[PDB]
Paper text:
Here, we report the structures of MtCNGC15b in the absence or presence of CaM.
MtCaM has been reported to negatively regulate the activity of MtCNGC15b, but how MtCaM binding affects the CPD of MtCNGC15b remains to be elucidated. However, the MtCaM was not stably co-purified with MtCNGC15b. We then fused the MtCaM to the C-terminus of MtCNGC15b through a short linker. The fused complex exhibited good solution behavior and dispersed evenly on cryo-EM samples. Although the cryo-EM densities of MtCaM itself were invisible, we can observe the density of the MtCNGC15b CPD. Consistent with the previous findings on the inhibitory effect on channel activity, MtCNGC15b exhibits closed inner gate. MtCaM binding significantly stabilizes the cytosolic domain of MtCNGC15b, as evidenced by a lower RMSD and confirmed by the structural observation. Upon MtCaM binding, the local environment around Glu533 changes compared to its state without MtCaM.
Residue numbers in the entry:
A (entry chain A), B (entry chain B), C (entry chain C): 58 to 577
Write the structure that this text describes.
């Protein structure tokens, strides 16, 4: 029943468990929005939203338990060096169990037990008190103490997911969306923390007001289960806490939660306040923490400093990721620009003539348009013998079948010619091979129209001008070289004037290549 | 009549159609500025501006349908593998029409039909009612559902344009300006959306006020077509909606649209309010959304989140584009600085004497000034044989003509020597070739002056100090070695002390190269 | 008298002209701070500040006209290709004058004539009116129309200065400080523009309030030359202009200029208001335009958009410059980290033993510490023959003079050997070559201690352990092989167990290189 580390079952399980962990990290901070402040100056907790969040977190936690179960029945590749083979997987249950308990089980278990699920639904009635609402506001430390192990373990899991899937994306879409996903998650967490802290500070303000009016107030009057008491309503109508605990008054510094209290975010429905808190987190994380006009209290200042540093790190990482995206997108255009700048500066230093200057840049433009960087030969030797030989045969089969000698011959030397064949490029009105010049390039025309004429060695009259097009033959003198049994070295004078009249791409090949092939 | 995809006609038509699509993307958001709030608290539609925008968008839609007509009669490169040639263009109308129907027609047609031009001019008068102004405020969903396909297809078409015209710019101007154009377009769209949403929220505030005063008010009573009614005057005199619906009052939470009513942007002329909305978009997109002190409403919060995320993406893209511009404009200086610091650190690690340091770090500086990087050999081999030989013969024609050997002899060996010469430099006060040193490179002086003397083998007296300068010849010993018929391998020693009086740029050639030339 | 374009005189003249242009750019916008709003609601200009600024601008324009003179008496390089030489300077005054008038005269002369020095000092006193103070606020267009040519031609001058001095800095200090200098210049220009526009807005408010009080006011009271008039003081007493034209009131929209009146910048001394406006420009360039709560005015909105775009561009340039600075200062550590990560992954994939992985890792750290990147042979072959041989002789003179064969022998083979030496590294406790292994390298010890012993061919007892240290000799077997007159191809076996006890630097010598040298 032990699953192989690289089995597809483990891969799909890790994928769906990454999805489940993202759901867990999105849902856990939502427990901070449970408290609701009503108009009667009371703190109540929505039962329906609490039940929904408890159910969702129970599903997430049972998924975590299933992950623990699966990881407790998986094999690990033993660090055996050996010489050959890779099957160092351990099928013994005791060995894999000891390996997992030595490292991995503690952090994966401290973040999997449903302690938040129980201490809200089974412990609060059992807790030493009869007030559910009050003892659920400051003691929500379990969420933030179990969130850290989950947020820590989410990174290595994503590392294995992106490692075991080949390339993450096409150019950088995954690399840019991952940081935005983490960024939205950080915004959500900060918004939930901000709402909880605003509720805490508003409760502190209410406690301060009760201390100011201790004659007819006691600390538990702000519990919303006691709002119906006659003493509660009498104190509420007599007291003026609904005005004192407001940012407009100077009684108590609300700091950055004055924005929460003024906007009445603590009294609205769940969706409205959730979206407001998420936007607040996004805004104060994106603006680098500016606008957090905090007060002289250590907790709120620490929260603001954490927000500012997290915003710095996340914004800088986003800028870096988008820079990497752009570099991956262009990369080739940048090198082409560098080459064009170099070939425009060098020809300026040497003071080339204008009539010849407009030719090198035209050839460079032709090369970029018809090839788009991509060094043919460097990428060509990278492929194996099978793939390289097959692709060279497929690309140039009818081209080599036009040669009278190569047509009726075995594939032994044919594939030798195909493998060693090289690309060729030529711009418009290029006198490719004038009559007389040595012919040491064997060109096969793959695209374009050519013109080649023989003026009887230099005499006007009988012309050999042929409208050579794609898939034609040229340089027959090198074929005469290949056909000559004697290993001579005297270069043949060109008998024709090969000129590139049109938009032409060719396939040049070295004369010594024919010499070596014929020598075999 | 079918147009070739690579023809100039399609290329120029795509240029003018990109211009038309940019006009469409700039004009379509302007429809949101039609509603105008008068001083008597009524929503009116600018008739002249509406007519102008209908005319402009009708012209844009005519251009769009002409584009559909043109692309309906276009040719494609068929996926025929073949071996040679590129004439895969299909002339048949049935096949091109069928494949265009399969992909391309739906997306380019849903963003081409003139729905905004009909549902404002021919539908509202025929709508089930008589309130033209009232039923033109909230139902502007057609603009935002038809704008998305246009902005989606502007990217592939712009990519085609920039791919069909070679390099986009000189260094990075096109790359840097495209992002800013998109940035202004996003700011304009956000400003138009902000104005429309501000009108929406102010209408909602008016509806809330009317609900508070339902005794003598109606929901359709706010339609500005009924401003002259006696009931209108009576209610407006009695009611206090002028002050109640304002950010100063606390009746209704305006939030981020409060700046519109405070600055009275919903009342001014078209140009003032258009510029205010555009600036609002640009400012709240440039500052990543800070200052959007939202209200506890889901739609406005979602709009603010969209603004923040779009601002983050656009700002990161701009940073990346500018960094790419900086890397492209310098590039060559970067590895020059790298080489300078490497040769400074290496010269310190090996503890070279101070006198010799001033020579190496001056030679490097002179090379940087004279060539500015640019690997002459590597850049030169990329050019074809014809271009290479032409460049070499133009650079060195009279230089090689001064030699007593190569002057009166055939251009074949002149071509051979010229195509294979290499550049060479020397710094100030260089003992280039002292007497007795081997003559391995013979040099052609093209820029600078030399100073070589022969002191009778080391005896004071008769001096051969000649003011040898540009366009001269040096290293005759290698010339004599090449002139020797017997293929000897003895390297002649220099008979003179070749010394560079000043900075000199020269052309080098290895002795074995000249031996190979003389062999043929 | 015609000066060489590359001469030292022109270089120093262009340096001091760059200084003068920067002074002009920092001084000319100061003319916007001339208007001062007094306490009695009037506009006046300080005479002393105007005199000081006009004197400084006169000095700057004198320098500009001297630059016109100098560039009208300079030589230009004729675009003659030629074959040899670079003496293409044209001494003909008529030709250089005609070339200058064709291009460069207009754009430099439009920024040289002293229009601000005449239309303030001779024109306004002779203008059709007596209000010298009033006619110096609206006509401040000459400054902004002449500034653009200066800010345009400053860039080519800076490019020439930075291209006429080799490298600009060590790594990127100049490339990062230039951006800050430009950024301060932009902040200064925008601050001056903001002050002038604030004065214009306040004057527009004054015109509006005089329109409201047309009965007892006309438009000329706000010129301060009439402050002592009875009508002026009576109107000031009766009118409420003191508090009406304030951003606190809602009479007239001050927009972003509310900060100007609230902070009372337009009534303080020169230094205070200048620093406040400069900080305003700096902050609203750095804050990307946030805080510019504009009004519904076209000019203000366009100004805010210009500020936002300038801030975006300048911030992007600064980010790019700093990234370039960091990549230039690190660069070498980058590929070292890449290589270390790559080799760690390579040993991880091949499953190397933990005892041999540490040795390769220690060798990598040794190489990084000893060389810090820097491809020794690649950097060495780039130098010319004179420098390379001198460097080799200095690095290894007695090292090759310690072997008896080369010491009392000619320097020919000495230099031949020294040219072909390559450095060799061996980490702590490196067992270098066994007893009996073929001798392939002839290494010379330059720094470190060795430990080599012979156990009588493998028998315990007589030991040849010697404390070989710096400046010692090894690899005698290759020397004996080279000493043999017969060109045999057998590699002698090592008769010692050479081992590097400590940190050792070596100079490996190729065996076939030694054979080639001895063959000469």
């Amino acid at each position: 029943r032990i699953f192989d580390p690289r089995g597809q079952t483990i891969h799909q399980w890790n994928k769906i468990f990454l999805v489940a962990c993202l759901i867990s990290l999105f849902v856990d901070p939502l427990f901070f929005y449970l408290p609701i402040v009503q108009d009667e100056v009371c703190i109540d907790i929505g039962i329906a939203v609490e039940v929904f969040l408890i159910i969702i977190r129970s599903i997430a936690d049972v998924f975590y338990v299933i992950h623990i179960f699966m990881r407790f029945h998986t094999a690990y590749v033993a660090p055996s060096s050996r010489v050959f083979g890779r099957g160092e997987l351990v099928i013994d249950s005791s060995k894999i169990a000891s390996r997992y308990l030595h490292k991995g089980f503690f952090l994966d278990f401290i973040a999997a037990l449903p302690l938040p699920q129980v201490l809200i639904w089974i412990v609060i009635p059992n807790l030493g008190g009869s007030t559910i609402a009050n003892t659920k506001n400051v003691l929500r430390f379990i969420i933030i103490i179990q969130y850290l192990p989950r947020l820590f373990l989410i990174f290595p899991l994503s590392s294995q997911i992106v490692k075991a899937t080949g390339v993450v994306t096409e150019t950088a879409w995954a690399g840019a969306a991952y940081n935005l996903i983490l960024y939205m998650l950080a915004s959500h967490v900060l918004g939930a923390c901000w709402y909880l802290l605003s509720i805490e500070r508003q409760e502190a303000c209410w406690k301060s007001v009760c201390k100011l009016e201790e004659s007819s107030c006691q600390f538990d009057f702000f519990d919303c289960n006691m709002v119906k008491d006659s003493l509660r309503v009498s104190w509420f109508v007599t007291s003026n806490v609904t005005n004192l605990c407001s940012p407009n008054s100077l009684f108590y510094q609300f700091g950055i939660y004055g924005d929460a209290v003024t906007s009445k975010v603590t009294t609205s429905a769940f969706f409205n306040k959730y979206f407001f808190c998420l936007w607040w987190g996004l805004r104060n994380l994106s603006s680098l923490g500016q606008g957090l006009l905090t007060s002289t209290f250590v907790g709120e200042i620490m929260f603001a400093i954490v927000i500012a540093t997290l915003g710095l790190v996340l914004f800088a990482l986003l800028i870096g990721n988008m820079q990497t995206y752009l570099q991956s997108t262009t990369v080739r255009l940048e090198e082409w620009r560098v080459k064009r700048t170099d070939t425009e500066q060098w020809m300026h230093h040497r003071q080339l003539p204008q009539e010849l200057r407009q030719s090198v840049r035209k050839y460079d433009q032709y090369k970029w348009i018809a090839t788009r960087g991509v060094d043919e030969e460097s990428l060509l030797r990278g492929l194996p013998l099978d793939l390289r030989r097959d692709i060279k045969r497929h690309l140039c089969l009818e081209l080599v079948r036009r040669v009278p000698l190569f047509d009726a011959m075995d594939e032994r030397m044919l594939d030798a010619i195909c493998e060693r064949l090289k690309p060729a490029l030529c711009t418009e009105n290029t006198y490719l091979v004038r009559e007389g010049d040595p012919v040491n390039e064997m060109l096969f025309i793959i695209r374009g129209n050519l013109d080649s004429y023989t003026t009887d060695g230099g005499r006007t009259g009988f012309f050999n001008s042929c409208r050579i097009g794609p898939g034609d033959f040229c340089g027959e003198e090198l074929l005469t070289w290949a056909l000559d049994p004697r290993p001579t070295m005297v270069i043949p004078s060109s008998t024709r004037t090969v000129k590139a009249i049109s938009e032409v791409e060719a396939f040049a090949l070295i004369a010594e290549d024919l010499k070596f092939v014929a020598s075999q």
